[PDB]
Paper text:
In total, we obtained eight structures, including β[name] in complex with UDP-Gal, Gb4 glycan, GlcNac-β1,3-Gal, GlcNAc-β1,3-GalNAc, and Man-β1,6-Man. All structures belong to the P1 21 1 space group, with each asymmetric unit containing two protein molecules. Using disaccharides as substrates and measuring the end point UDP concentration after 1 h reaction time, we have selected Man-β1,6-Man and GlcNAc-β1,3-GalNAc-α-Thr in addition to Gb4 glycan and GlcNAc-β1,3-Gal-OMe for further structural studies of the enzyme–substrate complex obtained from β[name] cocrystallized with UDP-Gal and soaked with various acceptors. The acceptor binding moiety has relatively fewer interactions in comparison to the donor binding moiety, resulting in a wider tolerance to different acceptors. The indole lid is turned off when no receptor is bound but is activated by forming a stacking interaction with the nonreducing end of acceptor.
Human β1,[name] (β[name]) is a key enzyme involved in the synthesis of glycans on glycoproteins and glycolipids that are associated with various important biological functions, especially tumor malignancy and cancer progression, and has been considered as a promising target for development of anticancer agents. The catalytic domain adopts a mixed α/β Rossmann-like fold commonly observed in the GT-A glycosyltransferases superfamily and consists of a seven-stranded β sheet core (β1, β2, β3, β4, β5, β6, and β7) surrounded primarily by α helices (α1, α2, α3, α4, α5, α6, and α7), a two-strand antiparallel β sheet (β5′ and β7’),23 and an additional 13-residue α helix (α8) at the C terminus. Based on the structures obtained from our experiments, β[name] catalyzes the transfer of galactose from UDP-Gal to a broad spectrum of glycan acceptors with an SN2-like mechanism; however, in the absence of a glycan acceptor, UDP-Gal is slowly converted to UDP and two other products, one is galactose through an SN2-like mechanism with water as an acceptor and the other is an oxocarbenium-like product, presumably through an SN1-like mechanisms. While β[name] selectively binds to UDP-Gal as the donor substrate, it exhibits broader selectivity for acceptor substrates.
Author numbering: 42 to 308
The structure:
């Protein structure tokens, strides 16, 4: 489907249990390297395969283009299509990831779309997913159920009435990090072209899920996704799935902390 870069992976041969699709801009190589060295590192988690790919568009900068070409050659984990990679094109980026799952990895049990300034606890997420007994039409994250479009015209998330004309958004989950069963990717890709476009990707996915009659659900009886960020502690971070507002150096320090304290107890 018009992909400039495709990861060197074969989901038919080895169906992944969890696929992470990470959004980042071209210049954010430090982010991607920190992820590749921490929670993005591919491995078996309780015998389940984890795969990690980075979603990129294109840029006018020839230097950044060359950097990303070299990075894809070195790492083989970039999914790319020809669209200007800017904040207000994040919907295209998300749909690219979903398209990739649909076309090349329909075997994935679960897919997480996530920001790059994130800590992800794949071990705890896997444990909760294996416990949920939800393998189809499943979508979770930080649920946002009573959202009103932001009409402050200079706000980062401003939408005009022509861009989104109704008083409330559909139910959706924070774009910082949400998780869905793999079949959901095909259903969303199928309905996407008939659903009204909006430049905020997490709202757009919510519109698609609503058209599909897919209901959002909480992953666990306790909160596990934290778009607002969290005060760090080892014992807390062992029992969450996702935390936002984490720069690369911090991500590396937190990962080291969890390694250093492996084998201690907590509650
Ligand atoms: C994190 C997230 O999921 N973002 C989505 C966003 O969610 C925000 C929305 O629910 C609003 C509703 O009032 O509340 C939260 O946002 C807070 C403030 O209301 C918001 O104004 C602020 O945003 C920026 C702020 O305007 C600036 O002055 C400040 O300098 O920087 C702020 C961030 O850059 O942020 C806080 C918390 O983030 C929710 O976070 O909803 C939109 C759609 O409206 C979209 O789906 C986002 O993906
Ligand atoms: C997810 O399911 C497990 C297993 O329960 C069995 O399989 C399910 C698909 C469903 O058909 C159940 O009725 C089956 O009994 C649940 O874990 C078990 O739950 C029972 C009752 O609480 C308990 O006796 C077992 O020891 C549990 N552990 C096992 C079987 O390993 C689990 O509760 C289900 N998850 C949720 C969120 O309900
Ligand atoms: C999102 O990406 C699309 C595709 O790259 C952009 O649309 C193109 O914009 C360039 C100029 O930036 C035009 O020359 C092309 O004709 C457009 N092509 C298509 C297919 O749209 C779009 O501008 C980007 N969005 C934002 C907000 O930057
Ligand atoms: O041109 C862009 C801008 C942002 N992003 C990614 O989109 C997500 C949201 O951006 P950011 O974290 O800057 O927004 P915030 O969390 O501050 O609202 C992050 O993973 C960015 O790396 C991207 O892929 N391309
Ligand atoms: Mn972010």
């Amino acid at each position: 489907g018009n992909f400039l870069k495709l990861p060197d992976t074969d989901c038919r041969q080895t169906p992944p249990f969890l696929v992470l699709l990470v959004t980042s801009s071209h210049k954010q190589l430090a982010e991607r390297m920190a992820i590749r060295q921490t929670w993005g590192k591919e491995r078996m988690v309780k015998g389940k395969q984890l795969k990690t790919f980075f979603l990129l568009g294109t840029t006018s900068s020839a230097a950044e283009t060359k950097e990303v070409d070299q990075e894809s050659q070195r790492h083989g984990d970039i999914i790319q299509k020809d669209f200007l990679d800017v904040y207000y094109n994040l919907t295209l980026k998300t749909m690219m990831g979903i398209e990739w799952v649909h076309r090349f990895c329909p075997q994935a049990a679960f897919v997480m779309k996530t920001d790059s300034d994130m800590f992800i606890n794949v071990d705890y997420l896997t444990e909760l997913l294996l416990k949920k007994n939800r393998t189809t039409r499943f979508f979770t994250g930080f649920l946002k159920l009573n959202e009103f479009p932001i009409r402050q015209p200079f706000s980062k998330w401003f939408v005009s009435k022509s861009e989104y004309p109704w008083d409330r958004y559909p139910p959706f989950c924070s774009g910082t990090g949400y998780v869905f069963s793999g079949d959901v990717a095909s259903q969303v890709y199928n309905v996407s072209k008939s659903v009204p476009y909006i430049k905020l990707e997490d709202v757009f996915v919510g519109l698609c899920l609503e058209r599909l009659n897919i209901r959002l659900e909480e992953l666990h009886s306790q909160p596990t996704f934290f778009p607002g960020g969290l005060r760090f502690s080892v014992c807390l971070f062992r029992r969450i799935v996702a935390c936002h507002f984490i720069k690369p150096r911090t991500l590396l320090d937190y990962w080291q902390a969890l390694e250093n304290s492996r084998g201690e107890d907590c509650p």
